[model samples]
Target: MCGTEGPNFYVPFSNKTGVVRSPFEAPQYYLAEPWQFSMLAAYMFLLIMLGFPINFLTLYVTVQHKKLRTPLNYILLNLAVADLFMVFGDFTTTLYTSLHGYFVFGPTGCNLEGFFATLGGEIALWSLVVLAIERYVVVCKPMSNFRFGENHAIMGVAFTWVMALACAAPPLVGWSRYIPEGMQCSCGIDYYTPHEETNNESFVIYMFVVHFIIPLIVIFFCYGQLVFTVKEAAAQQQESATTQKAEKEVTRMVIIMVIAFLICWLPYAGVAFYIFTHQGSCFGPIFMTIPAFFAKTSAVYNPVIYIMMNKQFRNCMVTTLCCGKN
Candidate 1:
């Protein structure tokens, strides 16, 4: 039942009625069993339910409240924009494809969805890097005479988008490609392409280092120093009211940082690593999809880190949401 046009190793099976031919060759069989499509649609529904409003509220509050128009918040707002854009761009496509059990929009849709997905993901990653560095400078270098103004924030935010565009656009330019991945309902980086057939190996390697490794390293170093600085200040001040509060704040920051890292990146990174090591091994459609699905959860967690956890933003959100003006 498999196409004669696909790779020689493709093994076709007529087990499920939902299995359909996809535009790509790697996942030649788009197996959309009941459980698979049901789970996929439900998860996409969940992301929309939580991510849309939360990210929208974040942007709305920042725009509505002049107090929240600080430089740091500008970066946070950009992050929210990325998250919202990702969900907005892909929700309809994903949900529609999920119900159909395959990508029905053809190559154009795959290209569009994949570019935005990677662009959105990379933009959020770089924004977090910028945010962490800003926090580090603010907390760790209190007397460095460095003033992070709107100009600096604009430069930082611009740098994030430029970097993300550079990273995500390479595929469109023929470096790798945007192809259907995981249940054939979503599109992403062409990870399944064979090494010899294309430069997918090089693309994946470059993406992993620039997009994943560098950001995590920079964030870890910044936060590590922040933790040390806070501990030292606490030791010196010995239970001073401000010192205790600083201690608590730093502790919370560290915990959130770790949790966010694990939640947002670890699964995708693990899958990439496994794919790198086992290049010739074939992964099932469902197995290929879980990591991408898990990574999308970052959109949900980001609002918590950037807005909900902040007492000022939370209060502003409450006021704006309830009283309709603040």
Candidate 2:
């Protein structure tokens, strides 16, 4: 029933139409001025410069060195790829938004931007799922030779893209229309009133189930099993000094990964769920806008975590960037 009374809104940077309402009006902080936007740009640029080199190096080393190409490393490669897409997409959108003040991209570009951003986010989320599952399997079924080999890893990556494509198809398929606001564009549920009650609510619910809730459940369960496995392994290896050290190291690694996932994603998930339930009515604009920015910023932090925490990754990065011994 929400309709706009105006000519089509034209965004500055791209051909996409803007929505009738400003997304920033959802909250106070969301209405960032040019100066704040500039600050965001500066931070994002710094993050991109640092993250891209490290992740690129990680990918290169993993691909070039046989030892680094474990099943786990394959998952890491996919994660890096996802991060790369997200950073690039965000960077582009941020630049456009800062200049235009709203989405300027046309319908097609808006849809494509939404799709790429969603795809990258989904891949990152599911990669975490895959990583957790892999760890659980290794810990719980150590004697079993079941592993995601090269072909399996390739297939998994393909499946991830397929799933991402499916998730992103709705906006492009006319379920949502990309209208212009002021100078920039964003992808939200189409504001047009239809003869039938729009299923935008249901669609958002479905997306939440698939993208956030289910993934969180899966991650938690896997981590729970992983913890139990580590405890058992530690108990069994108590008599052997070498085995004890190895078990401790593995436990530490799993703990670190779990902590990182929780830290990076929990706030985003919580805010997104809140938005889905309340739409724009219940919450103030600033509440939604700030969290959204925080969520977007989290993408750049992951690569930093990998480089700082994982020695192998750090060494590989050094080798790639410095062209020295890894």
Candidate 3:
């Protein structure tokens, strides 16, 4: 599962004139331009400046304050943990790319970096699915004893990590390997031609199915059922103001969550699937590089979506970080 190579690896320059040159060039399609680099850097800074503090505060409050430690908050804490890793992965990759113009971190670092990237992505995706399910249950099956239980949170988080690890393992185990010298060490399906013939296509296909299609299906189904359930509940209890309001709020949040996930991730996933399927096509490099920047930016945006849109989280954050002035 390991290979030896020199540490002086560099990214390759694109054959196109518009594309910038770098030393590392083996994993051919994952190159980015100078503007893309700047954008990635900006988003990375924003994520560190805003996302980390908020996620950290969420974790602190959820862990420290008794009132904030509900089943819902437990899932959110899990989400924050996932987001932290996501941000960390993106930041490290961006830093590495910006500095060296190629990944020089060697094969081990390449695998690790890529593993964390995929791990973080899986965790974030699954956590959202969990939240969607939780919301559905709370809104539709309020009396099913499924209300966030203390043990439920722990078990859910544990399960999330387990699944994430499993999903991340294949690439690290050699289903795909990092080609750091030619590409930035961000983990995706390996793009070297010889390996491309054997496992690359299937691996890339599996990545799309698992990462994009499956999660999207799950989110859509869960959220769709949730929306329908809430509508029915509200219609049945039209005279009940509190029930209507609660249902509306839950519905709004669910809609926002679903939309946010699609908007943030779909473009990248779409491009990835295309490139994965059409490896020999000239469209691969541009599609891959541009969407990568978008994908990284998507990770940074999750904290904003959670904190800004969820009143409870926002209030908690405000109280904890801003002394509750706002």
State each model's CA lDDT, in order: 0.77, 0.59, 0.64
Error of 3 at 219 (Å): 1.3
RMSD of each: 3.5, 5.5, 4.9
For candidate 2, report its TM-score: 0.78
Q: Which structure among the candidates has the greatest TM-score?
A: 1
lDDT, candidate 3, residue 5?
Answer: 28
- Regions of candidate 2 where Cα sits further than 4 Å from its true position: 1-30, 142-147, 175-198, 276-286, 306-308
lDDT of 3 by residue, 1-326 (tens): 12222332323344445444333443223365566555545665776677677777777766555667677767677778777787787575656565554555556666777778768777877787777766666666846655667776777777778878767887666675555432343545454332632375566667677767887887888788878887888899999999899888877877777788887777767766665565564543344455565655555567677754677776766676776466
TM-score of 1: 0.90
From the highest lDDT down, the ranking of the candidates is: 1, 3, 2
Q: Which residue ranges in model 3 land beyond 4 Å of their true spot?
A: 1-39, 142-148, 180-187, 191-198, 284-286, 324-326
When sorted by TM-score, best at the front, the candidate numbers are 1, 3, 2
Report the Cα lDDT for residue 39, model 2: 63
Please, what are the lDDT tens digits per residue for candidate 2 over residues 57-137?
667777656667666667778888888777777555755555555554545566666677667777877877777777666
Q: Residues 1-326, candidate 1, lDDT per residue (tens digit)? A: 22221331222233356554434433333454566687788888999899999999998888778888898888888889999877877765687677776667777777788889888878888998998898888888865789778898998899899999988898777787776676777788875555355588888888789888998898999888888898888988985988888788878878787678777888888888897888666677677777877778888888788779888899889998887754
* lDDT (Cα, 0-100) at 13 in candidate 2: 22
